[PDB]
Amino acid sequence: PNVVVTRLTLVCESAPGPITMDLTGDLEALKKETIVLKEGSEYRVKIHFKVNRDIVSGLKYVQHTYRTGVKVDKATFMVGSYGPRPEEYEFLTPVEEAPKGMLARGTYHNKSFFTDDDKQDHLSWEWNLSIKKEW
């Protein structure tokens, strides 16, 4: 395909190691993968993607976050226009603060969509974020 989503990374300097998932692999297995942030960490979501053949416009990243007892949190980010090249591009969301406090720890269930104004399903995937007192 012209657009290929390759990877999700949580960018956080204070993390003791990389926080990343390979989106070219088994998507069913991503749900079991442990993605941990220390509570209160400042981080950004980084989506890596390739544009292979043709200039594209209106790319968008959508993330739905499910947390027990809370209404689903829906966020849309404009990614924009990109031309073809061999090297992947990286899109980063604005910085956000991870949840903090005893009642905010544990599991956040995410469904992510990389799409565009034409509603193409470039990739849809699930992943879980675990918020912990320590790394």
Side-chain angles (χ1 to χ4, degrees), residues 51-69:
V51 179
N52 291 318
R53 293 187 301 276
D54 313 306
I55 297 174
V56 300
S57 61
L59 296 179
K60 297 170 63 176
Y61 173 64
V62 178
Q63 190 176 312
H64 293 184
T65 302
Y66 292 83
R67 170 66 173 189
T68 187

Side-chain angles (χ1 to χ4, degrees), residues 80-128:
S81 292
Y82 288 83
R85 74 180 193 182
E87 320 94 285
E88 62 178 26
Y89 293 102
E90 295 171 1
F91 168 77
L92 291 86
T93 63
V95 65
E96 48 178 322
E97 182 147 273
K100 159 191 156 46
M102 59 190 206
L103 296 198
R105 293 161 188 165
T107 297
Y108 292 79
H109 175 66
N110 301 303
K111 180 73 174 269
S112 288
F113 306 92
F114 200 76
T115 187
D116 59 25
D117 301 337
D118 292 322
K119 312 282 186 56
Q120 303 184 58
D121 182 18
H122 297 307
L123 198 68
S124 297
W125 72 103
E126 300 179 41
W127 55 287
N128 298 297

Side-chain angles (χ1 to χ4, degrees), residues 18-104:
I19 306 172
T20 191
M21 65 188 60
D22 177 8
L23 302 176
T24 74
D26 188 343
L27 303 177
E28 290 293 311
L30 298 168
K31 297 186 274 293
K32 308 175 304 189
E33 195 171 314
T34 292
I35 297 298
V36 172
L37 286 175
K38 181 173 181 175
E39 62 178 359
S41 293
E42 284 173 49
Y43 75 104
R44 288 179 282 174
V45 174
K46 181 164 63 172
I47 307 304
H48 303 240
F49 61 99
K50 289 176 129 248
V51 179
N52 291 318
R53 293 187 301 276
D54 313 306
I55 297 174
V56 300
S57 61
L59 296 179
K60 297 170 63 176
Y61 173 64
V62 178
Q63 190 176 312
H64 293 184
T65 302
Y66 292 83
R67 170 66 173 189
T68 187
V70 186
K71 74 147 194 68
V72 61
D73 180 88
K74 303 159 88 167
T76 300
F77 305 86
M78 296 318 138
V79 177
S81 292
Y82 288 83
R85 74 180 193 182
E87 320 94 285
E88 62 178 26
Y89 293 102
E90 295 171 1
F91 168 77
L92 291 86
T93 63
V95 65
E96 48 178 322
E97 182 147 273
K100 159 191 156 46
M102 59 190 206
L103 296 198

